[PDB]
RNA sequence: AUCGUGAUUAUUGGGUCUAAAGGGUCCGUAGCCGGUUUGGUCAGUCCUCCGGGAAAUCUGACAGCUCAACUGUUAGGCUUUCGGGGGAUACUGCCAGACUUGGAACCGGGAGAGGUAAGAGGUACUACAGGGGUAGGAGUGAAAUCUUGUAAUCCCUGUGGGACCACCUGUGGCGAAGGCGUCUUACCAGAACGGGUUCGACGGUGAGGGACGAAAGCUGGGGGCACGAACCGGAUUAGAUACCCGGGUAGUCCCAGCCGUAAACGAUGCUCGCUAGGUGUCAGGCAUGGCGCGACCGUGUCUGGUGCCGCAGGGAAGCCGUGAAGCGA
């Protein structure tokens, strides 16, 4: 059964990535996958993403720019705090100040810069580079 | 496009006998017979049900 | 060095470099997209074939 | 998916199309179509093919749509829904047939699994709907003396 | 069209093959009754303007031709005089392009394939040292390590010289070659 | 010894088709994992505050021991992973609904060696008896036992017997697996397919635990044509307690229970999304051409199975490859 829509989606864009595709749907949308989605395109990493509604929880026309690498969820969402961005950022990310962690906070949903930038954490969303 | 659409489709069949203005589903399930005075307008096929009397317009 | 099918860079051996059949403008292609028949769109004269 | 014991997955869905609206194309009413639904819920005709009866015969497209209401909401709203939802009650009848025919033909074990998928269909329906309130909690599924068809 | 679609009925272009392949779908217009599906002679007279253009932007003397079948033989040898390039039709060496210390030794700038499955040698020779590649698909055919796909009937005799003409005569009027051939000429000996 | 080496205990961070390793299959509790969505809370969580978390040892420097370790001051570390307040509401858990795709329920025309129960049937075999006929039949590499003059072999007639379901048959089908092939009937079940049909997350997996579970074997009652461990005999051979051949018991079959294991295999547990293609055939549905333009058969196409081929991908390779051994949950 459905149970993890979010790493279905960057599963998804992962594919679409390797295979070098530009364009690829997005299996049923969420207001956490528009959030992602939303700040994976601030980061220049995605192009474009529509919601386009069919009756049911909602798909994505997303237009990959050819800009990533790869891109999962972060499973468990680790609790963190200001004070603890670095480690996981040594472990999934590839260098320093390249790609960026998906987070989600009570402020918003944003990398990981942002958030120490907001000197507030919380629940670890994904990472992409 | 992304949407679905039913490639089933709804029928306007006119009744051979009273004249009904009814309403049938293309596949149907069941004998669709007249809703006033006398008549079967289709029988319930497998899939596409076989209309006995006039289809004025297929509709959407 | 910049695919018009995927974007990737042409650092391997095996990388096919070539003028726009439309424009004459240069259009890359990898061993991945030039394999599988990616399909490649020009920039600037939008020309796109298999 | 897959099935709840079989695990052969199958996509033979009822393609319902995107209508936010009532008809244009019909002129049946919502009093014509719950006046309906209310005599052939009295002639005895479960709820799975009311609505069947209604998109053929009358080309009913669906009663939400209409009316704003399900077939069940019609039936509780005008009190008349069973005591008992269709699907425990139509699980519940099944595997009392089954067990009539198992009594006699004992070497049948391939309907005794068959029996006992839908006896654990049976619980996760009743375990559902205890969850959700439909069902009391102290009324377990009895296979044996509370499973009657119609529960009092 | 630059030529007439009767024409290309007639001379057998439009005929193809009783199965095509999924990524032919784009040059295909319609399902004919008797099972050869017919391309897109739009697409095919498209192809060929726009290969033709590429092809103008290079001498002929550099140019590679293959062809492997009897069919393609005669029209791969008249392209091959009208042109100057270097045709292979017949067999082929399998390291003419590579193996420097081989006969029929050459270094072209682009490749030219006459049908992509028969000539997958050819293919796979200029995948390795990187040479782009114009090719002459069918209905049955895939483009894998092709640049340029031209949709035209390939197991016909007046088809491919017909189709050999038209590229000759439009990269010779595009390049200013003067191009005194006639399709008679490249018309097989029937 | 112990740590590291060693990702040789792997949450980070391993494998489990062939190297040790997928449980025979499956149902299923605690656990664990869980759809989009409006409304409310703020418990985990989040920022912050306040009470703590003894020094010692740790780090750096300063100061002072001649450098040094070392003692004091000091800025950090540990002590942890407690108690209680304020802010936030994304996240998850709590509260109340809804939503249709996930699963569940019903209807339709079709498919199936799907299951039990009953009966009939096909041919061969065999038992005895009768008729004909008269020197061997059987078997082997070759032989002999065996069988036959009490008339066998072979042929004809007739009557009973028990097992067994051929060709049809398929790189077909159904089934959870084991497995299921004569036919008819009754009972039951699932599936896919069609469905502007009912339901509203009701779902996945699942240690324990439960049922099914090939064959052999065991217990009790039957049956015993054939086959056939044991056993006996005839050869083979140095020997033959074996292969071969002649007999043939238990058993194979049925009826009522037990054991619970197989190379129970795809040596691939199950569920979901995702990822080039070409290519048989099967069920259903659907277009069209022919069809005695009807019951029917062809090509195309969607869905679900059933096979081969193989790019990318991955592997140590054989290979796998939308039916993963690919990429995630
Ligand atoms: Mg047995
Ligand atoms: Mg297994
Ligand atoms: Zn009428």
Request: proline fraction near 5%; glycine fraction near 8%.
């Amino acid at each position: 059964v459905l149970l993890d829509p979010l790493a279905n989606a960057l599963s998804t864009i992962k594919n679409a990535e390797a295979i070098g595709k530009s364009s690829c749907v997005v299996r049923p949308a969420s207001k956490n996958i528009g959030n992602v989605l939303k700040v994976m395109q601030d980061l220049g990493y995605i192009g474009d993403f529509e919601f386009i509604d069919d009756g049911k929880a909602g798909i994505y026309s997303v237009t990959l720019v050819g800009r990533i690498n790869k891109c999962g969820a972060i499973k468990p969402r680790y609790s963190v705090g200001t004070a603890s961005f670095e480690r996981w950022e040594k472990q999934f990310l590839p260098a320093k100040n390249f790609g960026a962690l998906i987070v989600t906070t009570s402020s918003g949903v944003m990398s990981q810069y942002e958030a120490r930038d907001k000197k507030i954490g919380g629940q670890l969303l994904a990472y992409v580079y | 496009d992304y949407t679905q659409r039913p490639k089933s489709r709804f029928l306007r069949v006119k009744c051979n006998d009273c004249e009904n203005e009814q309403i049938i589903f293309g596949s149907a399930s069941r004998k669709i017979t007249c809703v006033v005075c006398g008549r079967t307008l289709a029988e319930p096929t497998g899939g596409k049900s076989t209309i006995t009397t006039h289809i004025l317009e297929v509709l959407e | 060095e910049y695919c018009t099918s995927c974007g990737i860079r042409l650092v391997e051996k095996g990388y096919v470099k070539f003028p726009c059949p439309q424009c004459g403008a240069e259009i890359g292609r990898c061993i991945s997209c030039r394999q599988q028949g990616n399909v490649y769109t020009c920039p600037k004269c939008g020309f796109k074939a298999p | 998916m897959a099935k709840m014991h079989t695990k052969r997955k199958g996509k033979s869905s009822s393609t319902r199309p995107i209508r936010t609206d009532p008809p244009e194309w019909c002129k049946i009413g919502a009093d014509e179509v719950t006046t309906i639904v209310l005599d052939l819920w009295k002639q005895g005709v479960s709820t799975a093919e009311i609505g069947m009866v209604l998109r053929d015969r009358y080309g009913v497209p669906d009663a939400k749509l209409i009316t704003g209401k399900k077939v069940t909401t019609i039936l509780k709203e005008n009190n008349v829904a069973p005591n008992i939802p269709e699907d425990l009650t139509n699980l519940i009848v099944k595997a009392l047939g089954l067990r009539k025919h198992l009594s006699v033909n004992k070497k049948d074990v391939h309907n005794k699994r068959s029996l006992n998928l839908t006896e654990s269909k049976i619980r996760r329906l009743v375990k559902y709907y205890k969850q959700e309130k439909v069902l009391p909690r102290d009324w377990f599924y009895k296979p044996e003396t509370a499973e009657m068809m119609i529960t009092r | 069209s630059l030529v007439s679609i009767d024409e290309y009925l007639a001379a057998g272009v439009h005929i193809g093959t009783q199965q095509k392949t999924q990524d032919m779908m784009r040059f295909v217009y319609r399902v004919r009754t008797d099972g050869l599906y017919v391309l897109d002679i739009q697409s095919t007279d498209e192809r060929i303007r726009v290969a033709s253009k590429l092809l103008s932007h290079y001498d002929p003397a550099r140019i590679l031709v293959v062809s492997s079948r009897q069919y393609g033989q005669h029209p791969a040898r008249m392209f091959s005089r009208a042109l100057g390039t270097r045709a292979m039709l017949g067999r082929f060496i399998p390291g003419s392009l590579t193996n420097p210390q081989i006969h029929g030794f050459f270094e072209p700038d682009v490749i030219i394939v006459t049908d992509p499955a028969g000539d997958a040698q050819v293919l796979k020779e200029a995948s390795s040292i990187g040479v782009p590649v114009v090719a002459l698909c069918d209905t049955n055919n895939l483009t894998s390590n092709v640049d340029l796909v031209i949709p035209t009937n390939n197991k016909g005799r007046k088809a491919l010289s017909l189709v050999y003409w038209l590229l000759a005569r439009e990269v010779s009027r595009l390049n200013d070659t003067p191009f005194n051939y006639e399709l008679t000429d490249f018309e097989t000996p029937l």
